[PDB]
């Protein structure tokens, strides 16, 4: 068995040395990527504020209405048509517009808040028969009073 | 341990240098691709207008009917057969045509609008038993009045 033969040959093989160096560089890059992901996670945890509102909760519609009332100039929008045919066939229709799925940026108080109405692409909620949706408000800072004020304003507008 | 030996050898190995250069080029290309995606997202957010109408909302059928009434020369189409057998067996049938799933381009007012009737390939809506469908109107500009006018025209035609 050429155990020592390969060891000595590998020490003087430029190809093997280059391959080992490239493998080490790739491992270092993977470790750096993992460390960057961990650092971003820690930054989000310790210097950012988030509020997640699922579709089941009634604050979803209130927050969407508050958003469309506040940011009047929202280029991307989704429609909600209220259609009801009462007795004697009197059709009543009205178009209500809400922010479209995706990422939206709003300016409340003195902070930039990132609104993300995400519709999970997979499930169908049995209680509604519709895809699972949620809205997430993200902002920089450590004070949660802004989200509480937004929720209170949305509730007041809804009521 | 040959720690310094590999460092000195790697500095004078053409293969290792070429591999490191190729790795750097690949990383730069990946970063450029990510930056291009982010730039396209920002361009869509800040210079384009979108309106998303799900299948559950009743504006879906109204908008499809308005589209097939407006763009009479739509080469790609889908059929909707209304079949009803009243008492005494009087069969009434009528063929209604709507734009087929995919991307359609229409010309409203003085703007080019990209209509996309997409049928999500995955779910089955429990409320209808049919795949989840939605129509998205996309156009260049920052004025949302065009979509409002289209929706009003569709509602007027439907009523």
Residue numbers in the entry:
A (entry chain B), B (entry chain C): 1 to 159
Show sentences the authors wrote.
Bcs1L is a membrane-bound oligomer, with each subunit consisting of an N-terminal TM segment, a middle Bcs1-specific domain, and a C-terminal AAA domain that is highly distinct, forming a clade of its own in the broad AAA protein family.
The quality of the density for the bound ADP was further enhanced in the map with applied C7 symmetry in the final refinement and reconstruction. To obtain the best resolution for the TM region of mBcs1L structures, we performed 3D reconstructions in C7 symmetry for the two ATP-bound maps (ATP state-1 and ATP state-2) and the ADP-bound map. These averaged maps reached higher resolution and allowed more structural features to be visualized in both ADP- and ATP-bound states. In the ADP state, the first 11 residues at the N-terminus (residues M1 to K11) form a 3-turn short helix, which lies parallel to the surface of MIM and is connected by a short loop to the 50 Å long, 9-turn TM helix (residues P14 to Y47) that spans the MIM (left). This N-terminal assembly consisting of the 3-turn short helix, the connecting loop, and the beginning (14PYF16) of the long TM helix makes contacts with their counterparts of neighboring subunits to form a seal on the IMS side of the membrane, hereafter referring to as IMS-Seal (left). The IMS-Seal in the ADP state features a narrow opening of ~9 Å in diameter, which is constructed by the side chains of Y15 pointing up and towards the center. In the apo/ADP states, the membrane basket in MIM is separated from the matrix cavity by the Matrix-seal that is parallel to the membrane plane. In the apo/ADP conformation, both IMS-seal and Matrix-seal are closed.
